[PDB]
């Protein structure tokens, strides 16, 4: 009836082994599941536990069911940014036929990259096609950096977004911004 998940929001870096828990108030149990719903996408069945212990693995995932069954924990190892997603803990009043599942509000999981050999910088880019408009790009900054939002009606600034160059085993964050000409310069932009 009452599915409690915590934390509710979280942010961590790669290689780190996180874990989170679930608690609840249901008369009978039979199944306990953990999903990984992604932005705009539908959930994913990671695991389903029963009166069977507090340990079931699946790759870098490790579920844990309470003895009396009052709480569970999903242990994840060596975090990967691709794992950054919200995870839901869902229980059910036993019955493959007459059992309803109660979802938890979940916990928004967030994964940033390892910032080794940083080098923040802002670059002005020119239009491929001759125009009088342009954009400024801030890049190669440690994840700890926070990207302030324009708050200036005529200016547009995107949140940081990371890209990975597998070939070179490199990962760099970067935020962009642009306006409609006039009082615009990569200097004033991205200003705290």
């Amino acid at each position: 009836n009452q599915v409690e998940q915590s934390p509710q929001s979280l942010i961590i870096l790669e290689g780190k082994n996180c874990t989170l828990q679930c608690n609840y108030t249901v008369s009978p149990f039979s199944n306990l599941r953990w999903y990984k719903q992604d932005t705009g996408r539908g959930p994913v069945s990671l695991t389903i536990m029963t009166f069977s212990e507090n340990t079931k693995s699946n790759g870098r995932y490790t579920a844990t069911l309470d003895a009396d069954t009052k709480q569970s924990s999903l242990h994840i190892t060596a975090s990967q940014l691709s794992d950054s997603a919200s995870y839901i803990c869902v229980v059910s009043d036993r019955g493959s036929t007459l059992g309803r599942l109660y979802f938890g509000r979940g916990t928004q999981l967030t994964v940033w990259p390892d910032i080794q050999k940083p080098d923040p910088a802002v670059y002005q880019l020119r239009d491929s096609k001759s125009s009088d408009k342009s954009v400024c790009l801030f890049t190669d900054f440690d994840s700890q950096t926070n990207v302030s939002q324009s708050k200036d009606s005529d200016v547009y600034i995107t949140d940081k977004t990371v890209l990975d160059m597998r070939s070179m085993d490199f990962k760099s964050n970067s935020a962009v911004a642009w306006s409609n000409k006039s009082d615009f310069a990569c200097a004033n932009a991205f200003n705290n």
């Binding site: 539908g42 670059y123 954009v135 890049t139 547009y156 160059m165 070939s167």
Partner: protein, 244 residues
Amino acid sequence: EADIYQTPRYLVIGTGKKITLECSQTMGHDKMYWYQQDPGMELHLIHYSYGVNSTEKGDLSSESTVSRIRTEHFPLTLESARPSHTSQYLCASSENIGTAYEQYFGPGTRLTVTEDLKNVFPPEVAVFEPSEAEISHTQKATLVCLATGFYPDHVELSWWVNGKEVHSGVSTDPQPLKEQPALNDSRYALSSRLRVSATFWQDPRNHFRCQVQFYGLSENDEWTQDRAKPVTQIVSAEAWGRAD
């Protein structure tokens, strides 16, 4: 075999219209569900069925209807469209025996209710060649693509290099942006960055194309404005590697 199949994944509709989202399961699961999760919120079951001729509601204030005439189909429906319905839609189905298995892979149906539809606009793609500075100093070129003035939030950007959609060295804004937040019906904007080795960028045989899939109207919908009918389509912008 086979998973589930929800359709359409994208669709814009004017208030007062009869919408009929549909989804089917090639798994024979008797139990099917229909969840709705407004933006910025969790799942909320609205309708569920144990099988044929069974229809059940989860949130009394649903406003939608369903029909389980067949085990394979559990198509949801909303007689008259309303801007309050604007949100995502997930179709679910679960195993039938043992430790109940569940997979509502249903990619979901992105729904957009528009107060009258003269507020539909396709995107304006535009690419930006890297800052030579970035190159000299970094020795890596980062291309940017900008989708502008497009409503509703129904797009899918992709970069194609020399004819191949790439993923490495690419990052898009998980969430688009509003040009006029002051308007709940404000047209959106989205960016995207692509990074590569300067050397690679400097080669003029290397072609670059930022593709953008826009999901507008259907050829049948009524259009009357003095402009092209904003139908589901594609807009692109490309660039060529240059030494310089």
